[PDB]
Amino acid sequence: NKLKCPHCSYVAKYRRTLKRHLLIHTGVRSFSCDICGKLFTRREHVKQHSLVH
DNA sequence: TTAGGGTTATA
DNA sequence: ATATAACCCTA
Ligand SMILES: [Zn+2]
Ligand SMILES: [Zn+2]
Structure with missing residues:
Protein backbone atom coordinates (compact mmCIF):
# COMPACT_ATOMS: atom_id res chain seq x y z
CA ASN A 1 0.00 0.00 0.00
CA LYS A 2 1.66 3.19 -1.25
CA LEU A 3 -0.35 5.26 1.26
CA LYS A 4 0.86 3.34 4.33
CA CYS A 5 3.82 4.52 6.36
CA PRO A 6 6.67 1.97 6.32
CA HIS A 7 7.48 2.80 9.96
CA CYS A 8 4.06 2.84 11.67
CA SER A 9 0.40 1.96 11.15
CA TYR A 10 -0.48 5.41 9.76
CA VAL A 11 -2.33 5.36 6.44
CA ALA A 12 -2.73 8.66 4.59
CA LYS A 13 -5.63 9.68 2.39
CA TYR A 14 -3.28 11.36 -0.09
CA ARG A 15 0.28 10.50 -1.09
CA ARG A 16 1.49 14.02 -0.28
CA THR A 17 0.26 13.68 3.32
CA LEU A 18 2.22 10.45 3.78
CA LYS A 19 5.40 12.12 2.50
CA PHE A 31 13.18 25.47 9.04
CA SER A 32 14.50 27.75 11.77
CA CYS A 33 13.59 30.94 13.60
CA ASP A 34 16.11 33.68 12.81
CA ILE A 35 15.63 35.35 16.20
CA CYS A 36 16.09 32.49 18.68
CA GLY A 37 17.50 29.71 16.48
CA LYS A 38 14.85 27.08 17.21
CA LEU A 39 14.23 24.48 14.50
CA PHE A 40 10.86 23.57 12.99
CA THR A 41 9.51 20.87 10.70
CA ARG A 42 7.20 23.11 8.64
CA ARG A 43 7.47 26.74 7.57
CA GLU A 44 3.96 27.32 8.90
CA HIS A 45 5.35 26.36 12.31
CA VAL A 46 7.89 29.20 12.11
CA LYS A 47 5.14 31.73 11.39
CA GLN A 48 3.12 30.25 14.27
CA HIS A 49 6.18 30.52 16.53
CA SER A 50 7.05 34.08 15.47
CA LEU A 51 4.26 35.41 17.72
CA VAL A 52 6.44 34.89 20.81
CA HIS A 53 8.73 37.59 19.40
C1' DT B 1 2.27 28.51 22.62
C1' DT B 2 4.03 23.09 20.12
C1' DA B 3 3.44 19.65 16.58
C1' DG B 4 1.12 16.75 13.60
C1' DG B 5 -3.40 15.39 12.22
C1' DG B 6 -6.87 17.42 8.83
C1' DT B 7 -8.03 20.00 4.43
C1' DT B 8 -7.92 22.60 -0.39
C1' DA B 9 -5.43 25.38 -4.22
C1' DT B 10 -2.05 26.08 -7.70
C1' DA B 11 1.39 24.61 -10.91
C1' DA C 1 0.17 11.44 -10.98
C1' DT C 2 3.98 15.02 -8.09
C1' DA C 3 5.71 19.52 -5.74
C1' DT C 4 4.82 23.26 -2.94
C1' DA C 5 1.89 25.88 -0.45
C1' DA C 6 -1.43 27.49 2.95
C1' DC C 7 -4.88 27.48 6.57
C1' DC C 8 -7.62 25.03 10.35
C1' DC C 9 -8.03 21.88 14.31
C1' DT C 10 -6.59 19.68 18.45
C1' DA C 11 -4.13 17.38 22.17
ZN1 LIG D 1 4.69 6.56 10.29
ZN1 LIG E 1 12.21 32.23 17.84
Missing part, protein backbone atom coordinates in the same frame (compact mmCIF):
# COMPACT_ATOMS: atom_id res chain seq x y z
CA ARG A 20 4.88 14.92 5.03
CA HIS A 21 4.23 12.32 7.74
CA LEU A 22 7.53 10.53 7.04
CA LEU A 23 9.35 13.50 8.60
CA ILE A 24 8.19 12.41 12.07
CA HIS A 25 10.38 9.31 11.70
CA THR A 26 13.46 11.00 10.20
CA GLY A 27 13.50 13.96 12.59
CA VAL A 28 14.51 16.38 9.83
CA ARG A 29 13.79 20.02 10.75
CA SER A 30 14.66 22.18 7.74
Whole structure:
Protein backbone atom coordinates (compact mmCIF):
# COMPACT_ATOMS: atom_id res chain seq x y z
CA ASN A 1 0.00 0.00 0.00
CA LYS A 2 1.66 3.19 -1.25
CA LEU A 3 -0.35 5.26 1.26
CA LYS A 4 0.86 3.34 4.33
CA CYS A 5 3.82 4.52 6.36
CA PRO A 6 6.67 1.97 6.32
CA HIS A 7 7.48 2.80 9.96
CA CYS A 8 4.06 2.84 11.67
CA SER A 9 0.40 1.96 11.15
CA TYR A 10 -0.48 5.41 9.76
CA VAL A 11 -2.33 5.36 6.44
CA ALA A 12 -2.73 8.66 4.59
CA LYS A 13 -5.63 9.68 2.39
CA TYR A 14 -3.28 11.36 -0.09
CA ARG A 15 0.28 10.50 -1.09
CA ARG A 16 1.49 14.02 -0.28
CA THR A 17 0.26 13.68 3.32
CA LEU A 18 2.22 10.45 3.78
CA LYS A 19 5.40 12.12 2.50
CA ARG A 20 4.88 14.92 5.03
CA HIS A 21 4.23 12.32 7.74
CA LEU A 22 7.53 10.53 7.04
CA LEU A 23 9.35 13.50 8.60
CA ILE A 24 8.19 12.41 12.07
CA HIS A 25 10.38 9.31 11.70
CA THR A 26 13.46 11.00 10.20
CA GLY A 27 13.50 13.96 12.59
CA VAL A 28 14.51 16.38 9.83
CA ARG A 29 13.79 20.02 10.75
CA SER A 30 14.66 22.18 7.74
CA PHE A 31 13.18 25.47 9.04
CA SER A 32 14.50 27.75 11.77
CA CYS A 33 13.59 30.94 13.60
CA ASP A 34 16.11 33.68 12.81
CA ILE A 35 15.63 35.35 16.20
CA CYS A 36 16.09 32.49 18.68
CA GLY A 37 17.50 29.71 16.48
CA LYS A 38 14.85 27.08 17.21
CA LEU A 39 14.23 24.48 14.50
CA PHE A 40 10.86 23.57 12.99
CA THR A 41 9.51 20.87 10.70
CA ARG A 42 7.20 23.11 8.64
CA ARG A 43 7.47 26.74 7.57
CA GLU A 44 3.96 27.32 8.90
CA HIS A 45 5.35 26.36 12.31
CA VAL A 46 7.89 29.20 12.11
CA LYS A 47 5.14 31.73 11.39
CA GLN A 48 3.12 30.25 14.27
CA HIS A 49 6.18 30.52 16.53
CA SER A 50 7.05 34.08 15.47
CA LEU A 51 4.26 35.41 17.72
CA VAL A 52 6.44 34.89 20.81
CA HIS A 53 8.73 37.59 19.40
C1' DT B 1 2.27 28.51 22.62
C1' DT B 2 4.03 23.09 20.12
C1' DA B 3 3.44 19.65 16.58
C1' DG B 4 1.12 16.75 13.60
C1' DG B 5 -3.40 15.39 12.22
C1' DG B 6 -6.87 17.42 8.83
C1' DT B 7 -8.03 20.00 4.43
C1' DT B 8 -7.92 22.60 -0.39
C1' DA B 9 -5.43 25.38 -4.22
C1' DT B 10 -2.05 26.08 -7.70
C1' DA B 11 1.39 24.61 -10.91
C1' DA C 1 0.17 11.44 -10.98
C1' DT C 2 3.98 15.02 -8.09
C1' DA C 3 5.71 19.52 -5.74
C1' DT C 4 4.82 23.26 -2.94
C1' DA C 5 1.89 25.88 -0.45
C1' DA C 6 -1.43 27.49 2.95
C1' DC C 7 -4.88 27.48 6.57
C1' DC C 8 -7.62 25.03 10.35
C1' DC C 9 -8.03 21.88 14.31
C1' DT C 10 -6.59 19.68 18.45
C1' DA C 11 -4.13 17.38 22.17
ZN1 LIG D 1 4.69 6.56 10.29
ZN1 LIG E 1 12.21 32.23 17.84
